[PDB]
């Protein structure tokens, strides 16, 4: 892919299902000025992914406190994303979301981020931390069966922000 630490994270423009349940075309560059956690999950209607998606959504306030936008993405269609959002949580659905979920049906965003499982046309569990200038700071990629930690993601975002100010601080 083209995701390189210290270089601008690859831009994308893609249809997402938004927290209000409607579809909107969004770009990574829309979020310049905020930190971004951009994470891929393989497919809708799966069993490791909902734990991750619901945790990032449930804890979106903690990322807001860090001026950090969270965005999920999968190769499944935005229609499929919304079907999973609208599925009752009691039956395995996501329920209402506090984060947008991007659709990557052409697989080009996953390829740009180096996380396409090429023999299977779905993304690995890639997670990318992008700073407020659009520069990639952190790459995380898990094989399909192993999920990610919101605690660890928050630790990383906060630590990048703190070290960002190392040298900018009042010298009293």
Ligand X SMILES: COC(=O)C1(NC(=O)N[C@]2(C)CC[C@]3(C)CC[C@]4(C)C5=CC=C6C(=CC(=O)C(O)=C6C)[C@]5(C)CC[C@@]4(C)[C@@H]3C2)COC1
b/e code 106-133 from CB counts within 10 Å (16+ = b): eeebbbbbbbbeeeeebbbbbbbbbbee
Residue 34 tokens, joined? 């905020």
Contacts with 37 (C-beta within 8 Å, 6 or more apart), sequence order: 56, 63, 68, 69, 70, 71, 127, 128, 129, 130, 153, 157
Residue 142 makes contact with a second copy by CB under 8 A: yes
Handedness of CA 60, 148, 145, 107 (dihedral sign): positive
Q: Which stretch binds a second copy (CB under 8 A): 32-40, 80-88, 95-103, 135-143?
A: 135-143
- Of 20 and 143, CB closest to a second copy: 143
**Nearest-approach distance from CB 23 to a second copy, in angstroms:** 31
Any contact of residue 83 with a second copy (CB under 8 A)? no
Based on the shown chain and the rule CB under 6 A, indicate whether residue 118 belongs to the binding site for ligand X.
Answer: no
d(CA 154, CA 139): 14
Query: Quick one: which of 49, 63, 137, 150 contacts a second copy (CB under 8 A)?
Result: 137
Subset of residues 151 to 170 that bind ligand X, contact rule: CB under 6 A? 169-170
Q: Is 43 in the site for a second copy (CB under 8 A)?
A: no
Report the interface residues with ligand X, using CB under 6 A. Answer: 169-172
Report the interface residues with a second copy, using CB under 8 A. Answer: 5-6, 117, 124, 137-143, 145-147, 149, 152, 155-156, 159-160, 163, 166-167
């Amino acid at each position: 892919g083209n995701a390189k630490i210290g270089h601008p994270a690859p831009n994308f423009k893609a249809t997402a299902v938004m927290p209000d349940g409607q579809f909107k075309d969004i770009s990574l560059s829309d979020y310049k000025g905020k930190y971004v956690v951009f994470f891929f999950y393989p497919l809708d209607f799966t069993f490791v992914s909902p734990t991750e998606i619901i945790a990032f959504s449930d804890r979106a306030e903690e990322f807001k406190k860090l001026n950090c936008q969270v965005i999920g993405a999968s190769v499944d269609s935005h229609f499929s994303h919304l079907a999973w959002v609208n599925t009752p949580k009691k039956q395995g659905g996501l329920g209402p979301m506090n984060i947008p979920l991007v659709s990557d049906p052409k697989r080009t965003i996953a390829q740009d981020y180096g996380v396409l499982k090429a023999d299977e046309g779905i993304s690995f569990r890639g997670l990318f931390i992008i700073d407020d200038k659009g520069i990639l700071r952190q790459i995380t990629v898990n094989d399909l069966p192993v999920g990610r930690s919101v605690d660890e993601t928050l630790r990383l975002v906060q630590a990048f922000q703190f070290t960002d100010k190392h040298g900018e601080v009042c010298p009293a």
